[PDB]
Design a protein around this nucleic acid. Sequence first.
RNA 1: UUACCACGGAGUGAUUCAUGACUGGGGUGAAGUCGUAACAAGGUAGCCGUAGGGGAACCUGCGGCUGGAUC
RNA 2: AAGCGCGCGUAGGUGGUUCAGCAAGUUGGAUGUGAAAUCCCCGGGCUCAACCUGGGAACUGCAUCCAAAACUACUGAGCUAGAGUACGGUAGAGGGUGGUGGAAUUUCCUGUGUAGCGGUGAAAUGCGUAGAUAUAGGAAGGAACACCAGUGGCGAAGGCGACCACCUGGACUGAUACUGACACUGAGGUGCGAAAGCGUGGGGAGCAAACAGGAUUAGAUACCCUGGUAGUCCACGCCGUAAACGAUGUCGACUAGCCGUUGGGAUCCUUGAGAUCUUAGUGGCGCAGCUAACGCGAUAAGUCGACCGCCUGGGGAGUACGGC
RNA 3: AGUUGGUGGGGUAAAGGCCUACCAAGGCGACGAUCCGUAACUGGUCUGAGAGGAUGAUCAGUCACACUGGAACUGAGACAC
RNA 4: GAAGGUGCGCCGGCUAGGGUGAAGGAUUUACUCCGUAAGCUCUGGCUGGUCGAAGAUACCAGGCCGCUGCGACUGUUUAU
Lengths: 121, 89, 128
Amino acid sequence: ATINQLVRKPRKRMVDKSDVPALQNCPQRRGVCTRVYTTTPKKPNSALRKVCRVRLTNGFEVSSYIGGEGHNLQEHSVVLIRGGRVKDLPGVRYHTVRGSLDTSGVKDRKQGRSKYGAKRP
Amino acid sequence: MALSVEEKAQIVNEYKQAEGDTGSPEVQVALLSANINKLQDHFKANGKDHHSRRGLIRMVNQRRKLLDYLKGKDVSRYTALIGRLGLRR
Amino acid sequence: MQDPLADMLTRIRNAQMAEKTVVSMPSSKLKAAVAKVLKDEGYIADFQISSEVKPQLSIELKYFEGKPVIEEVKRISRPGLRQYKSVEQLPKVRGGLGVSIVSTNKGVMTDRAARAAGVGGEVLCTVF
RNA sequence: UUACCACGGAGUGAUUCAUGACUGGGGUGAAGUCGUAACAAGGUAGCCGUAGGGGAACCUGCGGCUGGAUC
RNA sequence: AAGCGCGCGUAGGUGGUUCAGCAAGUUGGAUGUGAAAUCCCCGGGCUCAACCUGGGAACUGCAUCCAAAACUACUGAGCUAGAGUACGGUAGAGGGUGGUGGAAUUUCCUGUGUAGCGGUGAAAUGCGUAGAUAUAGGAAGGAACACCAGUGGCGAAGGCGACCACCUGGACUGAUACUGACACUGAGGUGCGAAAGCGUGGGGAGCAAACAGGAUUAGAUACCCUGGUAGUCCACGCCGUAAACGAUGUCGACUAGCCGUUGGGAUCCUUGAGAUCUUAGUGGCGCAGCUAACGCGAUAAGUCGACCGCCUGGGGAGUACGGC
RNA sequence: AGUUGGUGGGGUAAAGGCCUACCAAGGCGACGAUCCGUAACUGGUCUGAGAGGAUGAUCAGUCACACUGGAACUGAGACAC
RNA sequence: GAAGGUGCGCCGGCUAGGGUGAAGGAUUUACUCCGUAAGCUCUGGCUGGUCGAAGAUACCAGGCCGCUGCGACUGUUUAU
Ligand SMILES: [Mg+2]
Ligand SMILES: [Mg+2]
Ligand SMILES: [Mg+2]
């Protein structure tokens, strides 16, 4: 606090590490699905969320949430992954963009179509 | 205070700058030096007297501080003091 | 010890918390001169220097409605961080109601006069 | 022809990255086994340093503290 | 979440008061430069806007020069308020080195004397008819010093309790005398640092980690009991940690009071024997003030100033790795 | 250890360990030398009340590079997309 | 001697010092001290040239490194 103590050692600012290290300062990355599975949420929640392990183009292996109702993804499927974690899913820190490359948009969606890659009918 | 009043009265007049002078640095440094050298005999026989050694270290630091002040004031007076006392080892 | 000036303000400030009438303390050029600005500004009633080999500085204090006139007095140019300002950069205490004593080269004198005189200096303390 | 010097070569180190049978702790778990160590004087007051011991929380000794109940 | 366990001290940071000088800091001005574009202000042209553009402002900077001397820095000369020295005295478990004493425990020897002693909630292990415990006399040995004893004292802190002798540090106290800012703090560094622990050598009464047995318990690697080794003790080395705490860094100044206590001093009381001031400590309330509250409150966690150390959510973790 | 100075000489358009011969043991560094990782720099840009924080696209100034390493030639000017 | 590497012959040019040492001087006291040109002798430094396939040219004269068991180590022992 002393102005002399500050002169020798200036105040230091911490730099928080990104919560999406596998994305590497890019808005989205392309990867392929190595394993499609369902997992169980934490204490409060109880469901079967669809998550897939993705091998990204920079070599990172991550698991990203598959949003929406129903998906057509299996092994060896090219997907685009976006940031944003899932709070009730441990270890999931990315989202799979529906409507790009192989992952088709959710069928029969009417509200919030752009967020889930849904065509206008 | 290991120096007797006779020893203190002995060394004050040999290092006084004028009559009645007991506060001049020459008297102080000479007073500390005689006490520092006298205590060396005690600490030889009593090597576990850590509490009395704290006082001896203070007398050593006090003498150093006085000599540094005498350095700034009059370097010639400083030079004669250590030569007469045999300091700056 | 290492800031006789800030001892002056804190001696004044402590007394006004205790509703004392006069204070005493060793004097100096800065202490007497700052008392000059305070008296001519009306924050202190009067100050005297007891001219002896060890001079004191005595301030009698002002209260308007029981509350002390000096609501707050704060040192600025402490010895650890001496503060120097230009004429344009001089502080305005409480939007001009207060006074920020500034030791310019035309003697110790207020911030209002310093702007008029067009000279800066060391911002010693702020009063209100 | 000599001097300088790039490529290339030899030896020996340093550092960094990735892997490695096996091994150690850590975290999270939908809850299983063994106890019940702390929270009330938690049923031997607790905790700190240290040493020894024990399936485990822990126990014991030595010093210290109150961030201990009754009085 | 955060005051290093505590001193000393290097670099550094900051430094009582008076006079004079200087002008690096400081202040004002001038000059050169600080490219253009952009930011900003006032206008102009695209039907407006985006956009373009005119001029100005700014570029908080640097360099030089000129003025000023309140403060800082420097220089010179002083002063005593800080700091220190000289003298008398006071109190103290302050430290070190050697002796000495009493109470008690244990062990051993001897006498008396006979069925228990010891232990626990109760028991049992244990001791005892080979004569225990108890009691009396003697001897050896080690450790700690009952009463005094007191929010008492001393010490930088850790700590220090029998008495005496020797060596030795500091504090408090009174006046006079002397130096004259010689000061404060302090990264590194260095020194001391409970207990446990480690090494070498001694010593070993009591206590007692480990260990063994007896109980309790569903179990009891414990609590309880019976023993008992290291250790606790001494010398010389090492360690370097504690809830090393007032969980409150050091130094200086100021801010109502009241009630105790330790070592002094001064005046009334010269009292025989109390009272009033003052100082260095040590406690309890308490105005103001502060605090999230609890509470602190002249021994501040209030109002300030100098310096230093430290904190940036919990766990992972004061852990891994490397260095010493 | 040309390391840091000095002296003589050479060399450059020009001073200089730029090079060399000899002499001395110097030079930098907790005011962070050396080493490791990253990185073109600035005017500027974004954000912010400001102080600050982040950043160095377009445009402008400087720098470095031209498949990798090195070297000179010509030329006023290069060690030359 | 970890490992590993460079130089090394001969002939010139320049150059730095040991030792010894008539002189001379001193103590011109004496088996005295200082010192000494040349001459002998020893150790270097910096350069140039030159021959051969090869210069520590013969004889002479360590091979070295990594992991691991055992014994700490030098030593002693079954003369055969
Ligand atoms: Mg084998
Ligand atoms: Mg052998
Ligand atoms: Mg044989």
